[PDB]
Write a protein that binds this ligand. Structure first.
Ligand SMILES: C=C1/C(=C\C=C2/CCC[C@]3(C)[C@@H]([C@H](C)CCCC(C)(C)O)CC[C@@H]23)C[C@@H](O)C[C@@H]1O
Length: 250
């Protein structure tokens, strides 16, 4: 059976599309306001050199900080999110922040050359740029594989926004108080996504493949946390980050 989308489900999708359009600028016009990207010579991928310079960290920290602000705005518009206690809201935002950033970045990712292209060459991010920010291949390679796999699903924008919303409103995040309420909110979003796929997604499993990407994100979250810890050990590193980044990942 392929039941039609209820009026409420249609409304939820409309609200989420609007939220995304207001919080994700496809022209990347604000990027010139971030601290400039600096790319030192490191063809050898020297960990020692990368840590001593962290040349790309200020720019990426600013990009991520900016993105967390946009994610906060997006989350506030998810139907039901405001009904949660502020304590639960913050817990969900802090624990999903890096995951939603990885998801939303798929919009700028291109399989032409496996990079995140955000306008001019100055804002094109490749694997080598991430290593210049202090991260290792243990995170980057799996990150790229994730991007390609998500790209191949060819999600409708409707599916893309629902997935980011479901990622944020997850009842199994450590620290949540009212798991039952959170689960109710997520179920409403999940049922909307499942109904949309059966009804609006033409042939040629997609729902299952999407749920699996959420599990993949948990692993990337874990690895990023481990690497952020190592990064924080570097003297003078805090100055290369931002107060928001320090709080969310610290
Ligand atoms: C941000 C956005 C973009 C790209 C995401 C990328 C490319 C560069 C490296 C990033 C920022 C990854 C880094 C592993 C995260 C490092 C962060 C830190 C230095 C604090 O540990 C995660 C997602 C990656 C651009 C645009 O799509 C908006 C989006 O919102």
């Amino acid at each position: 059976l392929r039941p039609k989308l209820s009026e409420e489900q249609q409304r939820i999708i409309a609200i989420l599309l609007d939220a995304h359009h207001k919080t994700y600028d496809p022209t990347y016009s604000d990027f010139c306001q971030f601290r400039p990207p600096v790319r030192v010579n490191d063809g050898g991928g020297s960990v020692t050199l990368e840590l001593s310079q962290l040349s790309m960290l200020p720019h990426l920290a600013d990009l991520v900080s900016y993105s967390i602000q946009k994610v906060i705005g997006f989350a506030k518009m998810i139907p039901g999110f405001r009904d949660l206690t502020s304590e639960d809201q913050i817990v969900l935002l802090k624990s999903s922040a890096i995951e939603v950033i990885m998801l939303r970045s798929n919009e700028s990712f291109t399989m032409d050359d496996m990079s995140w292209t955000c306008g001019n060459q100055d804002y094109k991010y490749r694997v080598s740029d991430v290593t210049k920010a202090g991260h290792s291949l243990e995170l980057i390679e799996p990150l790229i594989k994730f991007q390609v796999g998500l790209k191949k699903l060819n999600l409708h924008e409707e599916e893309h926004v629902l997935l980011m919303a479901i990622c944020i409103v997850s009842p199994d995040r450590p620290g949540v108080q009212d798991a039952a309420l959170i689960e109710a909110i997520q179920d409403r979003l999940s049922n909307t996504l499942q109904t949309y796929i059966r009804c609006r997604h033409p042939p040629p499993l997609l729902y299952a493949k999407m749920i699996q990407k959420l599990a993949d994100l948990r692993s990337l979250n874990e690895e990023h946390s481990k690497q952020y810890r190592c990064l924080s050990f570097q003297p003078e590193c805090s100055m290369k980050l931002t107060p928001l980044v320090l709080e969310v990942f610290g």
